[PDB]
Ligand SMILES: [Ca+2]
């Protein structure tokens with residue numbers, strides 16, 4: 001058996017329960033979770049308002065993890081007992097979440113934890129790094145020298161998208177709110193107050209031409225703002241492009257737009273190997289000091305998960321997360 | 331709009347003055363124009379990157395105590411109006427912006443009107459130590475009128491305020507201190523005890539050898555062991571620095587009790603926030619009746635001399651150690 005937090009019904013509390021401990025099937029390893037990375041989507045799932053996540057209740061939530069391999073299933077040779085690992089492993093599509101002491105994970109989803117990171121630090125980068133990578137690299141194939149605008153540079157996907165873009169040689173700019181402008185500047189990017197109009201910051205920073213690549217990490221009206229900021233023949237990508245939008249800007253500018261939906265891999269069981277690969281890329285960036293997760297200093301035990309999400313969403317009067325929130329399971 | 335703030339960029343790095351975005355008050359918060367920033371030894375431990383319990387990684391703006399004026403109020407706030415002078419323990423830990431800044435957006439619950447009789451400097455050094463002293467003496471020990479109370483380190487930060495709280499609540503107060511502070515402790519109205527004397531000796535002279543009903547250790551380490559030695563049978567010992575390993579035998583022999591004090595939890599976990607402003611209201615009530623006066627080192631330091639301010643707090647680089655607490659004048 002093991003201890004895990006279960007959300008029994010919509011909007012219900014994170015109930016600590018003693019449950020049967022998962023056993024690794026062939027191709028899987030058993031991970032003793034030390035840190036669980038939170039994400040806003042978990043809150044939507046908890047509230048039963050995340051149809052795209054296909055994670056009906058009751059269920060153990062949490063998508064990212066960082067821990068140690070304690071058992072290896074048959075047909076596995078990529079990891080050994082004692083190895084520190086991390087990755088985006090479940091919490092969606094019926095997959096057991098990471099708000100647990102243990103999880104049986106397909107080895108392809110894991111990568112060794114970067115030696116330079118604590119478990120907390122490593123636990124918050126899987127989903128957002130993969131989300132940023134899929135958009136910047138897989139879809140937009142960002143090139144050295146291109147001008148890149150990250151909408152919401154202080155956010156989960158934003159701060160990692162900025163660092164990936166910089167590492168790949170792009171000239172990076174990022175819109176952020178007051179409290180995050182200094183953070184973005186320190187990363188090496190050019191900060192832009194998010195209250196400004198695209199026509200204005202594009203004028204100041206791109207001679208009014210627009211940006212080669214715009215990564216919308218906020219969605220809604222921000223995606224429209226992104227269409228406005230993109231250069232002719234440019235590319236716009238979004239990881240929250242679920243709404244309806246006027247497309248005229250893309251035609252007038254003979255531009256391109258791509259959608260990003262990282263969850264597909266776990267929901268449909270396809271391209272699992274690509275996850276471990278992307279995480280390996282992240283590790284390389286950490287080793288060379290070009291990637292550092294933004295981790296809120298606050299700690300939360302497996303018994304304080306509710307408070308963890310209050311922080312993630314800045315609800316019930318707790319300051320909003322400044323960087324991401326990690327739960328210390330062990 | 332922007333503001334000037336001192337930022338510690340890396341472990342042991344200098345206090346770097348920077349022009350940064352001025353904070354904006356969210357619902358439930360008020361924007362405080364900081365006039366005085368109160369220092370504390372912990373800030374230096376955080377600066378050196380050796381304060382894990384503080385959860386304040388760098389780069390960051392340090393400083394936990396403040397005293398200033400409300401210049402803007404966020405939505406849903408009715409406890410304070412623009413222009414109100416306030417003071418409180420507001421940040422410097424758990425990722426919260428420190429007070430070495432011209433402004434700070436603070437949850438109204440953490441604030442209390444500044445005592446009218448105190449200058450901004452005086453009020454700025456009161457929050458943390460008062461709250462620390464109060465949680466031990468009242469919340470944990472519930473000091474009662476007539477009880478004998480021994481404050482270990484009466485001239486120190488928590489010590490001098492603990493003495494005054496205990497006296498105000500009717501207790502017979504005694505305090506151990508080093509030479510230079512013995513006179514100060516006597517002045518407060520407590521019976522001074524040279525810190526070099528043994529517990530069995532001062533307990534004999536002042537409690538007929540019975541010991542004290544309540545002992546507050548503000549120094550920790552060996553001083554906590556000495557506290558276990560000075561406590562009366564069935565007595566209570568509290569400490570705000572009880573992190574080490576100690577022999578507990580004395581507590582069984584004396585069928586006594588011990589309680590720990592850790593004020594930071596409130597700010598690190600965001601629970602019991604309202605209790606902070608409430609305790610500071612208690613402090614204001616004591617100042618008002620002339621029963622509480624913070625010990626403030628006469629030396630002054632501008633936002634540009636923070637490094638020197640802490641040299642004083644720690645008595646580093648030849649500078650004389652603080653005699654009372656050190657306050658930074660921001661505005
Ligand atoms: Ca996030």
Ligand SMILES: [Ca+2]
Nearest residue numbers: 371486487655
């Ligand atoms: Ca002090």
